[PDB]
Amino acid sequence: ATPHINAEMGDFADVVLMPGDPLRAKYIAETFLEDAREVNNVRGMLGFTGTYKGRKISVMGHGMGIPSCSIYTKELITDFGVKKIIRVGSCGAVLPHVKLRDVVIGMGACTDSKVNRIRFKDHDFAAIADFDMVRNAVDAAKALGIDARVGNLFSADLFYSPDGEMFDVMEKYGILGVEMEAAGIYGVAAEFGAKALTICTVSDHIRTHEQTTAAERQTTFNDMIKIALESVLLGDK
Amino acid sequence: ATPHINAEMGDFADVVLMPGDPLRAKYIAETFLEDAREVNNVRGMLGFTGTYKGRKISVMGHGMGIPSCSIYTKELITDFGVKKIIRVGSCGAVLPHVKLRDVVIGMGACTDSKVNRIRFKDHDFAAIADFDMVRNAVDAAKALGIDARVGNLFSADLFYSPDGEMFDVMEKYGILGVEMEAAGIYGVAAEFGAKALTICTVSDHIRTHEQTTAAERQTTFNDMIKIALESVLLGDK
Amino acid sequence: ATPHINAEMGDFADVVLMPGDPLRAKYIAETFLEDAREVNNVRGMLGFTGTYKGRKISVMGHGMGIPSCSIYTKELITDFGVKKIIRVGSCGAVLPHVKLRDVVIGMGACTDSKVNRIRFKDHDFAAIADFDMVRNAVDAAKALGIDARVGNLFSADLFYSPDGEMFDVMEKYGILGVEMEAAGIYGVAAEFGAKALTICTVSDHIRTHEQTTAAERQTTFNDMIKIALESVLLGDK
Amino acid sequence: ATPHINAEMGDFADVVLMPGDPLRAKYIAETFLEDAREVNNVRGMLGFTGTYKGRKISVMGHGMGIPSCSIYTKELITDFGVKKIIRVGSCGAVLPHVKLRDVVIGMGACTDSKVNRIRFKDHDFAAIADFDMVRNAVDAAKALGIDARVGNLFSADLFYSPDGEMFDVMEKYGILGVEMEAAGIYGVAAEFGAKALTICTVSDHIRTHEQTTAAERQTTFNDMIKIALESVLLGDK
Amino acid sequence: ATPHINAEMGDFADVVLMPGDPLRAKYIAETFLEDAREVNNVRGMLGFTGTYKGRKISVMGHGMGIPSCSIYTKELITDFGVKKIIRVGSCGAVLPHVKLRDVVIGMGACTDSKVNRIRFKDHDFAAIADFDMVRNAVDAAKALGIDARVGNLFSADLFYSPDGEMFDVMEKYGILGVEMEAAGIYGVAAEFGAKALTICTVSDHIRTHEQTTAAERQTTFNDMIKIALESVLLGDK
Amino acid sequence: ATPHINAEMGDFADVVLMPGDPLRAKYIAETFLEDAREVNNVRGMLGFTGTYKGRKISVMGHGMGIPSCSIYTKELITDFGVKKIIRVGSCGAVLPHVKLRDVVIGMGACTDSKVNRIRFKDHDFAAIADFDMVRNAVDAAKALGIDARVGNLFSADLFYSPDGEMFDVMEKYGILGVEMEAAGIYGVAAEFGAKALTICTVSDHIRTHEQTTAAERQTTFNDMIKIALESVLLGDK
Ligand SMILES: O=c1[nH]cnc2c1ncn2[C@@H]1O[C@H](CO)[C@@H](O)[C@H]1O
Ligand SMILES: O=c1[nH]cnc2c1ncn2[C@@H]1O[C@H](CO)[C@@H](O)[C@H]1O
Ligand SMILES: O=c1[nH]cnc2c1ncn2[C@@H]1O[C@H](CO)[C@@H](O)[C@H]1O
Ligand SMILES: O=c1[nH]cnc2c1ncn2[C@@H]1O[C@H](CO)[C@@H](O)[C@H]1O
Numbered sequence A, B, C, D, E, F: 001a002t003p004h005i006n007a008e009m010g011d012f013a014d015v016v017l018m019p020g021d022p023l024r025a026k027y028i029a030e031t032f033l034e035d036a037r038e039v040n041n042v043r044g045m046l047g048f049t050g051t052y053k054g055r056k057i058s059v060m061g062h063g064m065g066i067p068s069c070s071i072y073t074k075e076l077i078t079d080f081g082v083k084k085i086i087r088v089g090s091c092g093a094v095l096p097h098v099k100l101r102d103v104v105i106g107m108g109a110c111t112d113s114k115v116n117r118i119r120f121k122d123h124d125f126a127a128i129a130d131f132d133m134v135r136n137a138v139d140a141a142k143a144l145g146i147d148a149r150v151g152n153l154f155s156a157d158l159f160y161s162p163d164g165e166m167f168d169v170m171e172k173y174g175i176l177g178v179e180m181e182a183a184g185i186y187g188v189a190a191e192f193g194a195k196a197l198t199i200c201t202v203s204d205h206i207r208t209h210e211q212t213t214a215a216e217r218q219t220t221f222n223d224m225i226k227i228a229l230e231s232v233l234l235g236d237k
């Protein structure tokens, strides 16, 4: 057991899906996993392990922010033998051509956090996803008739930033979505030699936004999880 | 309702106690509050509002890390009229004379995060607590026969830092405890003109540690909450 | 003696008051101390020692700026056994709700200097005063019928800043006054294990360039000094 | 023409391969392109245009370092309508599991340069390649019986670094190769809306200073070029 | 032979003139040197050695950018016994009172590059030329009746800067010319123990946008060269 | 009259010598100036005006540290018509081949202060002296038979640095003397449009730990002064 995960080696699959909202974890276990069993409850961060098409898979939330998700991904990798981490969340878009409910894959993750500089002697570390995981997600989405956009994400430390001009800079450089964990997970994966990928759905447009229905949201959410799970099987082949 | 708090103005008291672990929120409501009612459940971050000696009080967790707690404290202050935020958590000590279970009050909070530099044009912002709240907590602790140590805390972005030499630097400068939110809350309070204070109990010694019993832990925890609640009443006088 | 102080162990009290102006120190010794004697004059930085209500006390100027005052405070602490340092100076107001002849107590000090980053491995070090000294001053002021403000000061390296944008920034985050050394003094206090406190009277206000000595300004300056002297008495108890 | 390229719109193809050595560009045009013609010679930076399997293609050197290559790529994109840039060079290995005559594809590029921070408001910008170009190269290499590595490259400003500590840091975080311009090229691609990719063969290995041209090294260099050329063909489809 | 220079100790003189353009080195060899032989052409970076007034002199291009010239100057200093390096390049003017074709002597060089911060523990290293060398150039210029301003140059990493506002900051602080190597050459001279000086010809104006043409280039460029060669002779005496 | 100088336009000459020590200014006035009158003593910062070889000259202390001298040099330049400022101070040696009492001419000044970064958009501003002024000082010195090295000085913010390793970095890069004002005076001269030069007397050795005494101080300090005063006369001719 670790400080935040009361479990033992073997309890988690070597692949873990991680949503931000802790509540989505049991939903994924009930909706997509077979023979699921609870493997964690510390701090209410519910963890599960079951199978998908025979493949062993685990799901557990990471909390909002780089610091929070850095704790969980690190422990999973160093103490539970986890080899692949797939974050499945949501993000806000700054590009006009990026629409609500679009599925985005973060091959890279920009950030305003200082965690990677602290790791990389104050130089620029390109926090990137595992290439094969990226291509797997892309191929899985096409199979499900969904066109995923691949590019850069931006991991913000402040959901409510004091300076809104940064959003224009993000748009100018092609940022596909604004979220809060990707850069942290990518840093952890590199530090402890594991693989990671972040998949997000556009939940809002940080500017001229619109609206979606609850039915629309679950459909998109279930689409993202399907893509993630099928990408794992592709990776296995 | 805000993006992370599904409630309306008036649902929260003007004073909110905030533990890290979301599970501690309902414990405080059941153990210390009268006529408590649920006011939030978004993302499982349970919020409550009741009274203590007739005083209206709310309790809700903030999650681990500066980014997470920055979201909640900001929304509470700008949308629910909250005026005082008291974080009640735990920390690790680097000073030999600081013992397990000691109660520490963070008048100031050092950090390796970039949030305040982003706010203060890349200069040094002294993230500090409200002075009166500090003195109230100190006076409340003495009344309960507890001697609280007042000083600097250090808010780490990485619970598992790559460089352990920073701990010697922290010890050398008198850091009383290592936690992960204080500097963020202090920054938020200053940005939106509210008051904040962080009270922590030493749960471990980042070096030569020992052990505590579960009974010892709850006693200390209940002591900290008592100090926090009584400090509020003192502040009211 | 030291390279900047031509005196010997014993010549100073374990408590030292420090104005920036060497002439202000002579004025203070002359006005409030009994049996005063000059104990230093190197570079014209007059230091005196005498007693206040039978309590042995010293007063010495520290020049302008962090580089200057950090040299003197460091030497007093490591070579003359000084335990407490109380800077008594003036500051410029940035907040509109703060007017001239107002006593400010610096519980914390922000800065644009790099000295504390050089000390704290490029991270954010919260330069704070000693809690007890702050409380003693608050209580002494109250006993004198004075309502002092306790908050953040801003220590600038450039009295003549090349960019006035920072004043709006300071005001936004509640800085009470702008001076030039509190952050440096708090930094050496932490580095060499001593205690310090900065008390200031508002000399001028950026919110309308106005500052003109008078009987009431001089009355307020003397009140600050009485607060400093009376606060050490409370501490002795 | 531009200040560094004495040619006209049309002289270059919408795809440009770029080695660092001007002489390597002449070698490439001569070896793989049909109907090749020199379209630039300013400052000796030879650029050529011809066709590969009937596909119009260009190849031009970009000199050493981010400052140099960023001038050329920028001019090609904004003044010659160039859409894709593929840097074909050499890199030094830092990982032991990576040996000479190894094809590396830079999905991302870390750097110690300040150019991207200057662009991204002092924050972390993840300098990444175009996903499609990466995939096309991976697939072309596979069709040639070559197993290319896809990961992070490190772009250094100093070929002769004043501190060898960074190599251990790079190795720790999995950097595949050390070169001098990939991060700069990815930055201009993002700034001016074009697509780029860096492919490298491992010239030497810091893990034992060894690098000696030979028939098998030259064979591997040609394979890289074939991968570059064949990858653009796949993209065209 | 070094990694980028195919020559042997003795092929270069103890003094070397360096324009960024290889073709300009060739022109200097043919127009000012007697019995000039080619001693290097790796990567097309032409180097020559001959005599001037019976004095052995070398001339070799160094390419564009700090990373490029850092390589060449380092190899010359450590493997070919070169003691003095004189950069003879072009630059852009920011000040209105600096006309095209004017000669500037870089006593100092500001920069936006990080190379010197990496050498100087992230502090401010004033990249300055060798005093005697500067003095020789000023006298040599007077002896030729040519005008030459002595001051600061600014070595930029991006010829196409995304921040035009900085040109206002340069102008404000009296920057004479904008080029791309000086600060790097001075850093190398200091790191490896040699002496350097940069002389520049204002080839354009950042503001007005005038680009060198006519026969103004020849005479003006030949004036820069006459100063360099002659300043060397004065140095010998 | 300015905030820190109680004088009127005309009381100071267009040239001003400035030691950090006020008492040393007094000594210069009495020992080298004819008909020397006191024109300021605010905060004890003694200023004097008299003649040397019939030339009107002023001399005033500036205190220790960049923040202190920045105030005085600025006020002199903008409110008293001062055109040239010559700092005549002491410094510590880092190089073994620099003996006590040696004279150093600061052509450039490195620093660990942030003042120039604040002026230069966080980039590298090479703080350099005025060429002519440096040249005048070198000739004046030769005319007196006194030795004087011309080079870089390092302006430190902390006389008691917590980082001794940096002394190795200074030595490595040829730093001639460690003092505390040069880089600030040069920044001010450039910001407000005046000319400056810093001449120093090696009063100690960071390494060996020797402190100025005997009659070595007098003659050596008088040699520094003779150079400054005389360099001025050469400047006039
Ligand atoms: O617009 C957005 N900005 C920043 N983070 C967002 C946004 N939309 C979704 N998230 C993601 O949701 C949580 C915060 O509500 C974070 O976990 C973040 O990854
Ligand atoms: O030793 C410690 N280091 C860092 N944070 C700690 C420590 N002990 C308690 N916390 C606190 O507990 C959570 C992390 O487990 C964070 O919320 C932090 O504030
Ligand atoms: O407006 C102000 N800005 C900065 N420092 C000030 C101001 N007013 C008073 N001081 C204080 O007075 C001296 C400078 O005159 C400095 O010692 C500083 O602490
Ligand atoms: O070990 C290496 N370190 C840095 N750059 C290298 C290395 N090996 C090849 N290059 C690449 O070759 C040129 C320099 O010779 C640069 O263009 C760089 O990209």
Ligand SMILES: O=c1[nH]cnc2c1ncn2[C@@H]1O[C@H](CO)[C@@H](O)[C@H]1O
Pocket: E020, E063, E064, E065, E089, E090, E091, E092, E093, E156, E159, E178, E179, E180, E181, E203, E204, E206
């Ligand atoms: O306006 C200018 N900005 C930046 N560098 C310049 C400018 N003019 C000449 N150079 C110089 O010429 C090459 C680039 O063409 C670089 O070597 C640089 O030193």
Ligand SMILES: O=c1[nH]cnc2c1ncn2[C@@H]1O[C@H](CO)[C@@H](O)[C@H]1O
Pocket: F020, F063, F064, F065, F089, F090, F091, F092, F093, F156, F159, F178, F179, F180, F181, F203, F204, F206
């Ligand atoms: O070793 C030294 N380190 C730093 N400053 C020095 C040293 N020696 C002389 N000064 C100079 O003297 C004053 C401080 O005593 C400062 O004004 C500084 O410029």
